[PDB]
Design a protein around this ligand. Structure first.
Ligand SMILES: CC(=O)CC(=O)SCCNC(=O)CCNC(=O)[C@H](O)C(C)(C)COP(=O)(O)OP(=O)(O)OC[C@H]1O[C@@H](n2cnc3c(N)ncnc32)[C@H](O)[C@@H]1OP(=O)(O)O
Lengths: 280, 280
């Protein structure tokens, strides 16, 4: 499967683009205006530049990768792609609209995949007449590094789709895991509450920020502390996910801390805004 | 502080002993039977042997460490020690008995400390005439290698007592973290519920074991998958820790999954029994 369409050119969409193009695939990134399309590819390039500098690739490796890539704002550009990964915007109404368009545009065998963290593959599937070829294919930031992809079956998802996406994953050297659609899949369901837990510990006067992070690095060999990890992932992302977990399950187990919610309202979202649980 | 009594010669005690004695302290380890102590000192010797074979220390170093360790059956030898670390069983009635007894035996300045994972420092402190000198000082397995000690402050724990323990941990190469007593402190309050989540995920047929573990190792960069980590910590321990959290807080958020409760009744406790989530 040579040809892969990716909707969305932000941190995640672009990373995913780099991931496919770097293992042979041709990729078209699509967004709402050229400003964004361009900015992302820009960032891909910067990414490969840093890889050449670190002797992880050759200038030609790179120069080639970039040629397998092109931008656009027309969905219509997806008519010959074999895979679609939507990594646009975590809103159900729009995703339904988007998948209904691609149902129309794309060659009937084209599998349609979502990079959603929270929303229902099934419900998106339902907006098309190919529910059986609608799947979630969920990468992790930074997408060219992290080897995992959750392959999430919605209720109608076929075996054959599942297998194709599994093989496609193996072929860009990711490791796929089967998930039956359910709130937060596997990673987010564990990882974010962990971070939310910490915010409660913080809020409850139990321990200061640096002690909490140190406690998990050095007490549990974690690669980083949940607070810094959150500043990395983005507290808004984190709050959103806790909210979906809460809303999807009706289980108060997943309630966000008032603290987390206050930081996100402050706009202290972490790294990307120079400030969250820590300062930068 | 040059002199530490370690109540308990199990895995945890023997490690705590090695941890103080390898960095200058005189240490006495005590247990209720001479076979128990000999084992512990054997554990310590084999370990020190490894570090020699690994050129991490010299043979001379080894002998020096050992010469700073004596074993005993006699609670009274603690009389003259600067610090007690209780690393015996995880039961409140008895911890109070032990702490009451050490109150009687020890010189007024002796600081009395508990390696507990979940239990109330305040409560244990309340069975003594020394509450200000009572604190938690929580190592992590294996004690000689892991650098965190959660230093758990009970309700009445003086600043003076805190600082000295703080100071004492740095002086043997650990990073101490200050913890105002609350259920599960920091590490377990976070880590154990993550394992419990794994179990719910598994219980709910969202994914299967190898997949849950792989997901966390490859999507989250954890050094081990939560289910295996359960098997190694011991499911009975994990379940207990979850019930403390639940009973302490009255918060449905820490309810343990039926599944975990079931496995424990099966005696499938993990490694130590040959079988937990995985087989061995
Ligand atoms: C949308 C959703 O579903 C929500 C989510 O995404 S949740 C998932 C988000 N992420 C996670 O869950 C896990 C978070 N990640 C981690 O914890 C990781 O372990 C980690 C980020 C700490 C990895 O850090 P690390 O191992 O020190 O990275 P590093 O050694 O630099 O290697 C990674 C690559 O990034 C690149 N890189 C390094 N520095 C960089 C920089 N300044 N700028 C850009 N790229 C850089 C390099 O290509 C590097 O490769 P080499 O080291 O081989 O040259």
């Amino acid at each position: 499967m040579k040809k892969v369409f990716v909707l969305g050119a932000g941190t995640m969409g672009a990373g995913i683009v780099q991931a496919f193009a770097a293992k042979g695939c041709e990729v078209i990134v699509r967004d709402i205006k050229e400003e964004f399309v361009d900015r992302g590819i820009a960032t891909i390039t910067k990414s490969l530049s840093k890889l050449v500098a670190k002797e992880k690739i050759t200038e030609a490796d790179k120069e080639e990768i970039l040629s397998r890539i092109s931008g656009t704002t027309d969905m219509k550009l997806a008519a010959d792609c074999d895979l679609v990964v939507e990594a646009a915007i975590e809103n159900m109404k729009i995703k339904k609209e988007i998948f209904a368009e691609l149902d129309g545009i794309c060659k009937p065998e084209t599998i349609l995949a979502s990079n959603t963290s929270s929303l229902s593959i099934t419900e998106v599937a339902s907006a098309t007449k190919r529910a059986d070829k609608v799947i979630g294919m969920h990468f992790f930031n930074p997408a060219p590094v992290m080897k995992l992809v959750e392959v999430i079956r919605g209720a109608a998802t076929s075996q054959e789709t599942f297998d194709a996406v599994k093989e496609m994953s193996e072929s860009i050297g990711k490791t796929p895991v089967e998930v039956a659609e359910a709130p937060g899949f596997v990673v987010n369901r564990i990882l974010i509450p962990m971070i939310n837990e910490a915010t409660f510990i913080l809020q409850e006067g139990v321990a200061k920020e640096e002690d909490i992070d140190a406690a998990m690095k050095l007490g549990a060999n974690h690669p980083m502390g949940p607070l810094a990890l959150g500043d990395l992932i983005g507290l808004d992302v984190c709050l959103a996910i806790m909210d979906v977990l809460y809303n999807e399950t009706g289980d108060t187990k997943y309630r966000a801390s008032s603290l987390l919610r206050k930081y996100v309202r402050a706009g202290w979202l972490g790294r990307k805004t120079g400030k969250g649980f820590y300062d930068y």
